[model samples]
Target chain A: SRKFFVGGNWKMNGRKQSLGELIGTLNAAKVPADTEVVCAPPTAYIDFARQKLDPKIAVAAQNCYKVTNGAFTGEISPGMIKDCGATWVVLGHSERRHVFGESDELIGQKVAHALAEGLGVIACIGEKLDEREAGITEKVVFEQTKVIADNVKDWSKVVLAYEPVWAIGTGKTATPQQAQEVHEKLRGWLKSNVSDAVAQSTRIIYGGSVTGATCKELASQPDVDGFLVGGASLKPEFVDIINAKQ
Target chain B: SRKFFVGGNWKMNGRKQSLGELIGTLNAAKVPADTEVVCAPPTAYIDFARQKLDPKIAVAAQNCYKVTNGAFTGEISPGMIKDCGATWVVLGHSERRHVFGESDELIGQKVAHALAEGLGVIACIGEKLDEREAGITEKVVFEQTKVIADNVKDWSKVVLAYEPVWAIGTGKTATPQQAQEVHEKLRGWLKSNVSDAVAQSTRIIYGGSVTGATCKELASQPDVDGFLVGGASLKPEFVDIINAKQ
Candidate 1:
């Protein structure tokens, strides 16, 4: 059985005062014990999450560079994240993909190094609306996943997030039917391409505008194991959404 | 006369423990009281610099995004950099321009926002081996500078760094003669294009492989105000470079 997981990606938001306040709010919230909760704060605030944050939750990096260390200005490396106490890294987020113009090859390199450095990988994959409209969703998503699937030696440390670029932070979500359709297809492909152990065990999550109102029906779907939240994750409602599966 | 300034861009390097030790070294070093010193640790360590570093030395960010805030993943915004207590930021380094492919338009947007938020901007401009070999160093350097030059409001809040791409980290430094030739030219352009006040006031520093051995001659050049150090910043010799002008 797949465990329900919820990761709040703070992205490029928050400050010291507000971050401590947010940590206080999250620390006080009564989220279910079984749900694996993670907060991917900006690289600058990773320490706040590790120390000030309640031990019940884990800290994640929004992204990390491929190198072990050195010469890449303006990028955090896997070793840097590890020493700073971040245990997981979110790679290939649509924001990083489209806004920063990250290529598929670079995301793969990041995944390889981050995993080698002992950080769990929240590896994201999905199609833009145009690709979904073009009906090449399988081809597009697979192109993003094949490199990680090839590079990631440990299946347990990786979680796949299928986030359609059209839905993220836009107040839109794929219907339970639509999101699960892609997830089920993605799971099947993982079984065929990677391994039966990986297909059966690795968590395949849904992203792109998840909310408390829609979460139950979405989490109830067979292939929808968890969420990689955007805008709403900042709210108290995130706690409600985390317990929704229960 | 402009106050001499040196900035250490500890780009994408340092562990938490090592950073504390480095900070202790910097706090204890006897630097010239007249010089203005800023050290930009990797973004992950900005808070450590702000809280733990000596009050005389200012803390800086190696880079920041050009936005107010929201949804730009894996990047720190100018506003966040401000609230975290970093009052300076490095932009348009050759690493970003060459390795990461940042365009003049994008670095312009970054400089505009960073300056708007009251953070000092250490805007970098330089030429490649090929461009310098072709003797179009003036043309190459200006194309990088023209964007920031057009957008800046306060001249005092900006520092220009001339780091030849060929010289950076390759142990080849632009000779004081070669460096002053371009620094004088850049200063002239700042005068004619931006204003006499900007020309006379703006601190145009040299970077590209600066060391304690080569410091005094480089610092003696009229147009060369100080340094934006690379590898040498981590060593005790950074203090020697800081006192070179005195």
Candidate 2:
């Protein structure tokens, strides 16, 4: 059976002093033994977060470049992320795709390089509001997933995060049924394209406006394994969402 | 008179152990009192670089975002750069422009926001190989510099780096005369567009395949106030480049 995985992507947020307090709160909280929790602060705080937080919880980089080292100004590579003591990296998040103009091809290359360096990847896929309205959600998401799937050599080190771009930071939440239907279809796709074992073993997490209040019902959905929390992750309510399965 | 400035743009390179060794090398070197030195490490190592290097040698982040913080995943803010003890940041590097697709408008916005937060900026401008061949180098660099100049209210905190895209990371070094021509023109532009005092006081440094062997002549040029070093910055000879003015 898959382990419940909860990831808090702090995004371009948090300074040392405030992050120290947040790390303290996470360290003091009681988390379920079956749950896997990871916190991704801004890149500058990775070492600080890894050093201060309890070792049971892992740290992740919000993103990394495709190569080990380069003349690429302003981009950090996977080795640097590992050097900072972070075991995981969240790649191809909807923000990366839509806001930063990261094409599917670039995301695929990044995923391949990150996996090549033995870093666990939270690979993200999703559709836009207009695409959903046009009933092309499956078409868009599958195209995105195929790029990620093409690069993934080990499903054991991958977590599939389905984050609907329309719902992210828009105060919108996909209903429990809406989320489950997509999760189920994605699992079916994995079962047919990859392998039954991978489909059964890989954790398919939901993102985009996931919060404490709605987490329990979403967690109860048979296909929903965990969450990739956003805004709520900065608050204490992240612990509540982490315990949704319990 | 403007102080001679030498900055090491480490790009997206260096792990903790190797960086620690480099820091030790810089700390032990005998730097001239007339020159100001700054080292830029990868984002993850900013705090470490700042803590270990001698206080006289300031630390800078290779890049930062336009805003303080937000949903812009993977980007660090100027506030975050300051919090990491980095007194400076490198903006609009040629790589950020050509390789990463950062537009002039975006770079200009980043410059304004970075200065507003009270961080020193090493603003970079350059023309590509083909652009230079077509004899529009002035038009290209002037446009880039104009955007940066428009954003700068306090010119005292800015260091202009003119890095020819053709020369950078390639073995081709810009001749001393060639570099001085661009630097003098930039100074003249600053005089007419900005003020005479800014033209006299601002450090207009040259950056394009500058090395220990070629730095002396480059440093001797009246308009070439300093150097923004690249690959050579990672080697022991960086100290030689630092002492070129001697």
Candidate 3:
């Protein structure tokens, strides 16, 4: 029932020339009509990517501060991201959570503020290798997702991205069953914690080392609506990931 | 003698139209020949500001990550800043320090990496009200400055900005003597810790609620080379502040 959503989080990578080439590659390719594609370049190139990318493909900021405008020196706000023509923002990415020390509360605040500013959000939640080893992956991801879900007012504008921390940029891919287990659990949680409509209609996408090779099987999972791609998204093969379901 | 340096930290403020107008205002202004002006806009607008602002008025990113590019989500890099035509970046502003929890070590890493990429840095340091009241203001500011100075290999491209946390956005202007005292002490620290040439040649600027009404008196201090302007930078008054050296 949910439309597939594919987001390319270019992360801290890409200069103008390289990003321009990537945008050209994306613009030239034909994505599935039912698929919604969004590309997130580094914050510096949000405007450039938005201006150059095909209108069918939306642009997203990798992250944004909670406030619309602020005295925050090193941070950009959702309003600024929207001003640059990016329609979406990726919040709570594993790097943002683990490396940058963004807490669940903070990420929730950002999600709330970004949605308030009328931007769609790709809200990421995941568990670390240790957490999975401890057999508490569900606990960690649920707690994180609860924070995000509590902050969200409109489920339609949010894409829940399940990117296991151990798998991101580590050349480790979760088995299709592993990913499905989490996604199905999350939907069940949403069904009880949020609403039945939200559970059925919201797209729960997968991330973390999602390559062209792994995308087809991953997309085959009934609950795996689409992807929030990382490094592989920079390559032309992202086209295949976008058409994986087809 | 040190060349006067004025930088407008637009912070998270300004949309395309307003920024374009501000850029136009800056472009048409007649800044003193001895004065150097730079504008640090939000990361998303670095390219726009660089493209629109007159070349004489340099562009700067509000902040950048330690590495050029990687898995660090949401952070822009000095290389990306440069690619967008911004030749400078502001690092370790009080807001980034307190509000966002950026550590001295992280700021130092950013300083080292940004310098490595050949971007001039406006390295900010200052004391909170409590720290000043406790008579440990110098110790606090020095500790912050030390981290930045320790990372810098090329002193020529750095402008030290002293922004007291108590004064910023609070409409509280630090007295001329107050600012001058810190600037002189910083220069002395540089002389003892680094080199006399660096101390003598480096431009140490003041920030924190700087305005047209207060800029001239503040600019009169021999050690106060210029300003890292806050809210006032968005107005016509910014031109006045830039020309205060006259």
Candidate 4:
């Protein structure tokens, strides 16, 4: 059975105190054993936060670059992420896509490079609000996933996140029904296109406006292995969201 | 009197051993107090490098964001840089401009925000190869510098680097006369456009292929007060570059 996973993307938020407190909260919480918990703090705090987190939990970087290391200033490399005590990284985020113009091709390069460096990837794929309104959510998301399919030979190291751009940080979430339909479609496509093992074992998670109250029904879906939480991950309810599988 | 400054932007290079060795070289060398020596390493090694380097030398972040903290993924904020033990930040380098498409206005915002958060600024401005070839170097540089003028309150916290884009990392430095001409023009503009005190106080450094062999001549120029070394910063020659003013 695929293990459930919840990743908290702290994004560019947090100070020394804020990160230390979150580490304290997780260390104190009675988190379930089967659920793999990883928190993506801002790049600066990776080592400091990783030291104090529960050994069962993992640390992740917000993003990384294609090259292992070189003259790409202002970019974190996969090697640097691992060296700094993170085992995972999030890529192709909506913020990178819409705000920073991160292309599908570039995100693929990053995912490929990151995996080669032995870091697990939370590869995000989502439809913009326009694509949904235009009724091409499948087309947009399929194209995004195909890029990952082209780059990644190992599916076990990859956790797919389906977050709608419109839903992120907007106090809106896909209804459990809405989120499951896409997760099922993704699983079906994986079964037909990749392989049986990849389809059965891969963890496809949901993101966007996932809070404590909204999490349980979402977690109840057959295909929803876990979540990649955003704003709510920084709150007390993150503990509740993490225990959604319980 | 204005102090001479030399900054080595080890853009995207260095391992743990190499950095430790470089720090050793700098520690053992007799560096002049009259010159300000700062180096920018990749953010992953900021604190490690800061702890080992001489107290007279300061550390710089390659870039930072306008917001102190938020959901801006894959970016370092000025406050984070400060918290991580760096005292300065390099903004609007030609690499950031051409490779990453950082706009002038965005650079201005970063400069303003970094200062508000109590970090020093190395605000870089330069003309592209085409602009230099077209003889509009002054015009191109003027527009870039004006953004800093609009955003900056204290000139004492800023070191203006006049790197011609054609010269950065291509190993073709602006000739001393060529560099002095622009630096002089920048000084004059600061006097007339920003303030007389700023014109006298802010050190105008030249960046682009500055090596120890070439640095002495460049440093000797009346208006050229320093250099921003790129490729040579990782080598022993960096010692000579730091002591060039001697």
Q: Candidate 2, which segments miss by more than 4 Å at Cα?
A: A169-173, B169-173
Error of 4 at B143 (Å): 1.2
Which residue runs does candidate 4 get wrong by more than 4 Å? A169-173, B169-173
Question: Deviation in angstroms for B183 in model 1?
Answer: 0.5
Quote the lDDT for A32 in model 3. Answer: 76
Better of 1 and 4 by lDDT: 1
lDDT, candidate 1, B1-246, per-residue tens: 898999988888898888888899999987786799999998888886788898889988988888876887788988878777889999999888888888889999999999998999999999888787788999988878899888798888999999878666566667789899999999999888888988998899998778899999899999999999988888888889999887
Q: What C-alpha lDDT does candidate 1 achieve relative to the native structure? A: 0.86
TM-score of each: 0.96, 0.97, 0.96, 0.95
Q: List the residue pairs that clash in candidate 2.
A: none
Report the C-alpha lDDT of model 4 over A1-246, residue by residue, as the tens digit.
888899888888887887788778888988788889999888777777787787788988888889876766677788878777889999998888887778998999989999989999999999887788789888888889889988897887899998878666555556789889989988888888888888999999997667888888899999999999888788888999999977
TM-score of chain B of 1: 0.96
Q: How well is candidate 2 docked (DockQ)?
A: 0.81
TM-score of 2: 0.97
What lDDT tens digits, residue by residue, belong to model 3 across residues B5-76? 999999989899989998888999987888899999988889888989889999999988999878788888
- CA lDDT, every model vs. true structure: 0.86, 0.91, 0.89, 0.85
Better of 1 and 4 by TM-score: 1
Q: Is candidate 2 or candidate 4 better by lDDT?
A: 2
- The docking category that best describes candidate 4 is medium
lDDT of 1 by residue, A123-241 (tens): 99989877877889999998888977877988889999989775654555677898998899899999899887789888988886678898888899899889998877777888877
